[PDB]
Amino acid sequence: LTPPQVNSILKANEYSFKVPEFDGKNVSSILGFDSNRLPANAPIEDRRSATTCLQTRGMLLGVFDGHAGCACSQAVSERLFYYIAVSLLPHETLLEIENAVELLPILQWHKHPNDYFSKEASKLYFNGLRTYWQELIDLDIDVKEALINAFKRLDNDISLEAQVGDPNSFLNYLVLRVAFSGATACVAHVDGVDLHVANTGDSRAMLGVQEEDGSWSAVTLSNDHNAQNERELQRLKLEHPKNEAKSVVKQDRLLGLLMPFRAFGDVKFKWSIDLQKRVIESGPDPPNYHTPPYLTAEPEVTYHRLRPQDKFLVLATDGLWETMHRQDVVRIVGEYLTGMHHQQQNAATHLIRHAVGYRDDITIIVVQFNSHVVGAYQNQEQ
Ligand SMILES: [Mg+2]
Ligand SMILES: [Mg+2]
Numbered sequence: 001l002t003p004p005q006v007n008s009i010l011k012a013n014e015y016s017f018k019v020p021e022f023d024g025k026n027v028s029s030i031l032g033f034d035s036n037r038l039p040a041n042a043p044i045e046d047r048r049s050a051t052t053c054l055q056t057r058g059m060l061l062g063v064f065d066g067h068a069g070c071a072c073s074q075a076v077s078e079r080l081f082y083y084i085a086v087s088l089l090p091h092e093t094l095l096e097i098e099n100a101v102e103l104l105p106i107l108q109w110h111k112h113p114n115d116y117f118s119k120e121a122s123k124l125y126f127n128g129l130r131t132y133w134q135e136l137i138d139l140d141i142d143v144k145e146a147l148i149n150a151f152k153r154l155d156n157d158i159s160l161e162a163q164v165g166d167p168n169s170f171l172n173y174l175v176l177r178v179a180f181s182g183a184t185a186c187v188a189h190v191d192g193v194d195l196h197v198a199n200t201g202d203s204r205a206m207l208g209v210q211e212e213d214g215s216w217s218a219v220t221l222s223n224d225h226n227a228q229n230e231r232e233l234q235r236l237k238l239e240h241p242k243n244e245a246k247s248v249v250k251q252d253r254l255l256g257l258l259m260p261f262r263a264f265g266d267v268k269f270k271w272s273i274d275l276q277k278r279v280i281e282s283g284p285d286p287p288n289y290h291t292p293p294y295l296t297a298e299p300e301v302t303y304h305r306l307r308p309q310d311k312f313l314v315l316a317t318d319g320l321w322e323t324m325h326r327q328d329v330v331r332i333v334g335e336y337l338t339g340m341h342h343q344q345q346n347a348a349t350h351l352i353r354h355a356v357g358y359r360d361d362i363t364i365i366v367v368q369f370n371s372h373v374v375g376a377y378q379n380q381e382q
Contacts, residue, residue: 006038006356013037014346015112017050019370029192029306029374030059033367035112036348038319038358043070046317046361047077047183050110056088058191060107063363065184065203065260065317071174072265073183076154078117079125080185081107083150086133094137101130120171128157143189144301147198151185155264155297162267163279173283180285182258182266185299186222186315188367193306193377195313197221198299201260204321207304208312208330210338218330221302221313224321225261227252232261240291247288255286255294262296269295308375312337312368314351319362323355333366 018032035048045066052059060081066073085106086094097104118125132153162179165172184201197205199222209217225232227249236254237245250256255269268276272292286294304310314333321329329351335341336350347366355362 003357009038010036010349010352013112013114014349015110016346017110027057027192027373029370029377030190031368031370033061033110033365034346034348035363035365036346036352037364038352038356038362040319040358040361044361045070045073046319046363047073048112048115048363048365049077049081050365051081051107052110053085053088054105054108055093056085056191058088058189060084060187060189061315061365061367062185062187063203063315063317063365064186065201065319065361065363067182067184067260067263068266069177069181071177072158072179072181074118075121075158075178076183076185076264077115079128080150080154080187082125082129083132083154084147084187084189086129086136087146087150087153088141088143089133089136090141091137094133098130098134098137118174120168121174124161124166124171124175128161132157143191143194143196144303147187147189147196147301148299151198151200151264151297151299158265159267159270163275165282169283173285176279176283176285179265179267182260182263184260184263184317185297186317187299188221188313188315190306190367193374195221195304195306196301197304198301199223200225200262200264200297200299202226203315203317206314206316206326206330207310208314208334209309210311210334211309214338216327216331216334218327220326221304223300224318225300226259227261229261236261236294240294244288244290247290248294250287255288257286258295262298264297266295306369306374307378308371310369310374311371312347312366314364314366316364317361319358319360320352320355320364322360323358328354337368 015035019028047064050061064073161175186203189196205221207219348364
């Protein structure tokens with residue numbers, strides 16, 4: 001945990017992806033992205049994921065801040081994008097996909113060799129998903145609404161999976177670990193010039209905008225869900241009786257315990273007392289709890305149309321934002337990419353080196369846009 005040891009961790013977790021510039025006439029509004037992570041906890045609790053939709057034009061990128069363990073953050077890391085993917089899929093594909101089980105490409109991951117996929121849950125997670133697309137097949141797509149549904153579906157699927165557990169003892173223990181741990185989620189969906197950010201928690205998305213003079217401007221694409229968010233404090237007090245205004249949030253924490261006011265997992269703040277107690281009798285592993293449903297995983301979605309002036313997007317957990325002001329981040333990234341960080345290797349690594357040179361896991365994804373392509377898209381609007 002000395003500078004050297006930290007350096008070695010950075011190189012070891014460093015990831016970089018460049019979009020296939022190929023002249024066959026390609027559309028990527030993304031030049032590529034960089035990502036890195038610094039652990040502060042034994043198994044780090046933060047996760048990072050990135051993927052291109054094989055059936056849909058877009059690309060999915062996200063960061064996940066776990067707590068009370070890595071179980072939930074690991075799970076949502078590898079499951080959420082599939083629920084989002086399926087959720088954006090048209091009826092015919094859903095069809096040929098179901099009618100395909102009784103197998104086709106949905107997503108293509110861009111994963112560091114270090115990150116992984118759950119071992120024994122591929123069957124379970126798969127069926128969970130199947131059931132979801134079957135429901136969609138039961139019944140024009142709005143990306144914002146697809147994100148909210150995809151998010152809420154996975155959280156609800158995690159809850160009942162914990163309730164039915166699978167006989168294998170390991171599998172049963174895993175669905176519980178996942179459901180009793182928690183995780184933040186800040187996802188960006190990029191389809192051409194359309195940028196959607198779905199946020200759940202205190203991780204955050206920031207757009208790097210370069211002014212006509214060359215100076216850098218940061219524009220927030222997500223609101224952190226915590227005590228520092230008065231609209232979130234008003235929403236919490238409103239979701240419960242008036243007598244509870246004095247206890248929903250006690251110290252700046254939800255019910256006096258949780259910092260993030262939205263998250264996946266953490267079912268200790270969602271389930272009824274009896275549901276909790278009963279489930280608890282299987283597998284040897286809150287204050288003013290009056291009107292039980294207190295935490296949601298439902299994201300806040302914001303839309304942004306990319307323009308030539310928008311150079312990059314940085315997704316990161318609060319591990320980053322607790323060390324630097326929002327504009328310094330953008331300034332630092334902007335100059336690095338602009339090659340002026342020396343005036344007077346990997347963008348994610350560079351930034352984390354600034355954030356550190358710490359008291360929480362730090363994960364960052366820096367996405368760089370192709371201003372020529374983005375400009376191209378714009379010229380065929382206007
Ligand atoms: Mg965490
Ligand atoms: Mg954190």
